[PDB]
Amino acid sequence: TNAFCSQFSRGVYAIFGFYDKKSVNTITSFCGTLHVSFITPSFPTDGT
């Protein structure tokens, strides 16, 4: 969350990063809310 918000304040157009099964919902929720795009090599989210 901290890193993400720092990036947002920095004014990034997109964010590439890794996530965990503990961290997946944070990323999905915040990216679905702030409409910032997220690129990940990690496992695919369950559902849409």
Binding site: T1, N2, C5, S6
Partner: protein, 48 residues
């Protein structure tokens, strides 16, 4: 309160995303309290 420890340094304005994050120490003493208290509720013997 029976232990007469001070519960709060400041009443309002704390920031959650501060980098690096400042944990208020008194919070720990809260955690302990909640953990060490035992009472009779609708569930049965309530002990943690």
């Amino acid at each position: 309160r029976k232990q007469r420890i001070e519960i709060s340094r400041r009443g309002n304005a704390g920031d959650c995303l501060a980098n690096p994050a400042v944990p208020w120490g008194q919070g720990v003493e809260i955690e302990r309290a909640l953990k060490q208290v035992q009472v009779e509720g609708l569930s049965g013997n309530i002990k943690f």
